[PDB]
Amino acid sequence: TDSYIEVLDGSRVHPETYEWARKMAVDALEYDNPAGALEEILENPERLKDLDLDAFAEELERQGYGDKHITLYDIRAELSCRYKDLRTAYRSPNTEEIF
């Protein structure tokens, strides 16, 4: 209608971590626009592999959010191929299955 749609809605990343995801995208591009940086990282995910997430997790722990190593790594893996079907690939029934 007349509102901007947050691109991360299509991804995982609970809405309580949109600010963290935006900051991670802005820092990976090594900028000094949140949405533009997010849209660029979504298409150039190779730049997220060089970012240090352990330092960010330590920063979060020192700020007062508790342990977030796994949460941040999950957000990074999400930026890389938003919602990737974790289900096992299709396989043809083997001999015993067919029998």
């Binding site: 900051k23 991670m24 820092d27 990976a28 090594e30 060089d50 970012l51 240090d52 997430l53 330092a55 960010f56 920063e59």
Partner: peptide, 23 residues
């Protein structure tokens, strides 16, 4: 000069060379 907010830094060369052997 000092109003710069925290910035998520990049990994060191040691980490970039070591962690690359894990997947």
């Amino acid at each position: 000069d000092l109003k710069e907010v925290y910035r998520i830094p990049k990994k060191s060369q040691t980490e970039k060379e070591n962690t690359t052997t894990e997947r």
